[PDB]
Amino acid sequence: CGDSTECSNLLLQYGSFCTQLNRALTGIAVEQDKNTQEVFAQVKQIYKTPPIKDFGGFNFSQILPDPSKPSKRSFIEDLLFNKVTFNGLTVLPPLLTDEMIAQYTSALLAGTITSGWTFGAGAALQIPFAMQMAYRFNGIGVTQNVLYENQKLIANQFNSAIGKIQDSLSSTASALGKLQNVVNQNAQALNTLVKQLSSNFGAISSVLNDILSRLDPPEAEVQIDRLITGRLQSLQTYVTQQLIRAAEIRASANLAATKMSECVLGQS
Amino acid sequence: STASALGKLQNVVNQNAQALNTLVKQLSSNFGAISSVLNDILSRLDPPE
Amino acid sequence: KRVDFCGKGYHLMSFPQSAPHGVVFLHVTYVPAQEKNFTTAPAICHDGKAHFPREGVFVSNGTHWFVTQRNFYEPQIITTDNTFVSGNCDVVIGIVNNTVYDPLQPELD
Amino acid sequence: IAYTMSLGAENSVAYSNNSIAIPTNFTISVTTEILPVSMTKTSVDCTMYI
Ligand SMILES: *[C@@H]1O[C@H](CO)[C@@H](O[C@@H]2O[C@H](CO)[C@@H](O)[C@H](O)[C@H]2NC(C)=O)[C@H](O)[C@H]1NC(C)=O
Ligand SMILES: *[C@@H]1O[C@H](CO)[C@@H](O[C@@H]2O[C@H](CO)[C@@H](O)[C@H](O)[C@H]2NC(C)=O)[C@H](O)[C@H]1NC(C)=O
Ligand SMILES: *[C@@H]1O[C@H](CO)[C@@H](O[C@@H]2O[C@H](CO)[C@@H](O)[C@H](O)[C@H]2NC(C)=O)[C@H](O)[C@H]1NC(C)=O
Ligand SMILES: *[C@@H]1O[C@H](CO)[C@@H](O[C@@H]2O[C@H](CO)[C@@H](O)[C@H](O)[C@H]2NC(C)=O)[C@H](O)[C@H]1NC(C)=O
Ligand SMILES: *[C@@H]1O[C@H](CO)[C@@H](O[C@@H]2O[C@H](CO)[C@@H](O)[C@H](O)[C@H]2NC(C)=O)[C@H](O)[C@H]1NC(C)=O
Ligand SMILES: *[C@@H]1O[C@H](CO)[C@@H](O[C@@H]2O[C@H](CO)[C@@H](O)[C@H](O)[C@H]2NC(C)=O)[C@H](O)[C@H]1NC(C)=O
Fold this sequence. Notes:
Chains A, B, C, D: Spike glycoprotein
Order of helices and strands of chain A: HHHHHHHHHH
Distance between the termini of chain A: 57 Å
Bound molecules: a molecule of 2 linked components (NAG-NAG)
Largest sheet of chain A: none
Protein name (chain C): Spike protein S2'
Keywords: SARS-CoV-2, Spike protein, viral protein
Oligomer: part of a larger assembly
Structural class of chain A: mainly alpha
Largest interface: C-D, 35 and 24 residues
PDB class: viral protein
Shape of chain A: elongated
Number of strands of chain A: 0
Entry title: Cryo-EM structure of SARS-CoV-2 S-Delta variant (B.1.617.2) in complex with Angiotensin-converting enzyme 2 (ACE2) ectodomain, two ACE2-bound form
Strand content of chain A: under 5%
């Protein structure tokens, strides 16, 4: 309507219509919050790494959170964050702010470094890192002798690999294609919806006030009705597109949660 | 003892029932016409209008 | 065996139950408790040779050394039957001194 | 009362390069999971409804 009493009175005769749209959108928002909370919140406590770090030669400085920075994020997290860039539409903030998500990730990582996979089932149990790596080689079918005899070489390879991945992520662009794609899709959908507000739909004008103060009521009402039906159709289309995209995102989030529960809290 | 442990199934049933309720309630809208009852329109006016 | 798929912990088995428009699973899982601190060591040097555990881990209660399974404290005396040999105690980082008892020599008397 | 959500408890597991922790007892826990599989079969006729 855009603040027009006549439009509201005309619209009253279409029955309960936008209650459906509001219910659908509220369902979508609740689903988003549930998705995030399900993926990340999977530990009962918040662990912390010891101040002194001697993990048999391995080096996790690139990944562990940095207390110096205000956000308590890490190097790779900062790289990822930096690389990627009205008429009743409203955007609601997510329930979880980024600091709490970073805190979950830090707790998970500290737990998996210090306890192995034991903290996934019960209470976390300490274990020296080299022995954990020996367990993990023994898992895949190689005797634990190999790691104890080539610890130095293995640590060097791991450090070189982590440095290489940091450099490749820092330099090469167009690596985070999917997230940027999602953002672009949402922004474009909103943009076209707001753009749609400037079409005649077979009426004499695209602005309501002019139509009001040009004709008598019995003739203006037809144009009003045409505007009403056109805008309602556009709104329905937008809602349906949002529903489809939300379903796809939910499937992706479920897959991510399964991957994180199976390949982080235990060997696969 | 404790209730509200079966939220998912109740949610599904409620959603279906509510969709049916709004669908059947939609049958009482003039939609810009002069009445919401077809038989009244047939009884009052003539086909050409 | 896929962690946290059905249950929360180590899976043992499950039971199905009907429900008006769905199913209800009862998962039975195993959860450990009542921990205890111990001192460890990756391998044992003895007679200039390194010994590793076939299946288990080395622990010490303060004075003696034992091998246990990784999920339940149950110490046993280190013996040439539950350990294997490879190399010499010169390239492992953390090896400690001890003696490995074997049955055949005392049996022979 | 309105407050700031608390993520959880706090602890710092004692890590050292020659110390482990081994369980000495166990427990058996039974949990439940619920999943929907179906919904009511409905049918609608055009010419009667419209
Ligand atoms: C882990 O690797 C990092 C590499 O980022 C090491 O940090 C570098 O250390 C050298 C030596 O002092 C410095 O010249 C670099 O400027 C450091 N880089 C950064 C980004 O700070 C770190 O020293 C390694 N860990 C240990 C224990 O040595
Ligand atoms: C570590 O375990 C050993 C093996 O049981 C303990 O040595 C035994 O201690 C008991 C205590 O009365 C004696 O009766 C046994 O004779 C000891 N064994 C031998 C072979 O002499 C040892 O005391 C334990 N240490 C600690 C700190 O618990
Ligand atoms: C485990 O950590 C400890 C301390 O963090 C290390 O102990 C040092 O070992 C060297 C080598 O013998 C000594 O020169 C130092 O004096 C020790 N530190 C102290 C404070 O006494 C130990 O090397 C590490 N690795 C193990 C035990 O395998
Ligand atoms: C384990 O025992 C061996 C021999 O019983 C020790 O090896 C001796 O170490 C000292 C100190 O470095 C040397 O002076 C001797 O020449 C070594 N003897 C031999 C035969 O190699 C070894 O040090 C002991 N382990 C520990 C951790 O002390
Ligand atoms: C195992 O040893 C540690 C250190 O000797 C015991 O002390 C705990 O150390 C951690 C980290 O330093 C603290 O968070 C705990 O509060 C300490 N315990 C107490 C009672 O204060 C520890 O208790 C021992 N036992 C276990 C099961 O870890
Ligand atoms: C493992 O834990 C169980 C209970 O969690 C212990 O069983 C209890 O033992 C005490 C003392 O023997 C009894 O008073 C209780 O009645 C027992 N509970 C039950 C349910 O039977 C068990 O003793 C623990 N394991 C060990 C080796 O002590």
